[PDB]
Design a binder for these strands. Structure first.
Ligand SMILES: [Zn+2]
Length: 252
DNA sequence: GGTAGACCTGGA
DNA sequence: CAGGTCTA
């Protein structure tokens, strides 16, 4: 899921779990658990803790318990559901948090690609994977100034810059491509080649793109099809080791 | 400073 | 491959 989707998950999941106390934690694919290293320690520590909050950082969900925070990343196909312990688990369910009221928080992921880290709450923010995470794209902490500072100091393409989690939190392939189209900037442009005007425009479109979604695509996945703004066929190449979609007329 | 190995599997 | 974010 994308940042706006994760924000939706955060908003909807919270009332379904807040105030519930963990009685058990069941793990069917240990590799999802990244900290503590031992999935049995991960399970043991959460037992007895009550869910107090749910926050989001980039595409990470941060479950706040009594003493610990649980940091979760769904990647592209991970999903959470709250349901009765009395009903059969859905396919590809890898982690289940059982509450004292007979309900469960279930983590499902066909790709088995998601990750979970648990730390003492006061430590979460200075440990992986949240450590070094850039500012929220919708926050004043993410400004044209910050973006310009990173752009000038690098020799990478502008797309690689925006894909860097330390520059800005949770900006993935789709929104990078969409934002660059809307900014009129070729993805393969060196970041340092961007004028001050291009940086300002890019920041504005980044915020608008992500901001509108949290509340139709121009280029992503539309290769071979006419540009919605000029009718030129959208093209697809590889930039920063990724599938990259752009209009060779609208973007320069 | 980077780029790239690692993780996973359904469908090209 | 298609995805993202970590560790090497
Ligand atoms: Zn166009």
């Amino acid at each position: 899921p994308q940042l706006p989707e994760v924000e939706t998950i955060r908003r909807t999941l919270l009332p379904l779990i807040v105030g519930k106390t963990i009685e058990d934690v069941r793990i069917f694919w240990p590799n999802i658990i990244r900290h503590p290293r031992d999935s049995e320690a991960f399970a043991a520590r959460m037992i007895g803790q009550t869910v107090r909050g749910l926050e989001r950082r980039g595409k990470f969900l941060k479950f706040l318990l009594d003493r610990d925070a649980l940091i979760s990343h769904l990647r592209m196909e991970g999903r959470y559901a709250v349901a009765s312990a009395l009903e059969p688990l859905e396919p590809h369910t890898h982690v289940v948090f059982c509450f004292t009221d007979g309900s469960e928080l279930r983590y499902r992921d066909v790709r088995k690609f998601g990750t979970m880290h648990v730390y003492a709450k006061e430590e979460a923010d200075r440990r992986p994977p949240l450590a070094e995470l850039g500012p929220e794209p919708l926050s004043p902490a993410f400004s044209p100034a910050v973006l310009a500072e990173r752009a000038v100091k690098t020799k990478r393409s502008v797309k690689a810059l925006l894909l860097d989690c330390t520059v800005v939190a949770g900006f993935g392939n789709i929104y990078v491509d969409e934002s660059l189209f809307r900014a009129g900037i070729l993805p393969g442009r060196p970041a340092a080649s961007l004028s001050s005007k291009e940086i300002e425009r890019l920041h504005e479109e980044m915020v608008a793109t992500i901001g509108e979604a949290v509340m139709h695509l121009y280029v992503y996945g539309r290769q071979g099809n006419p540009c919605k703004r000029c009718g030129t066929p959208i093209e697809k190449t590889v930039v920063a080791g990724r599938g990259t979609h752009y209009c060779p007329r609208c973007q320069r």
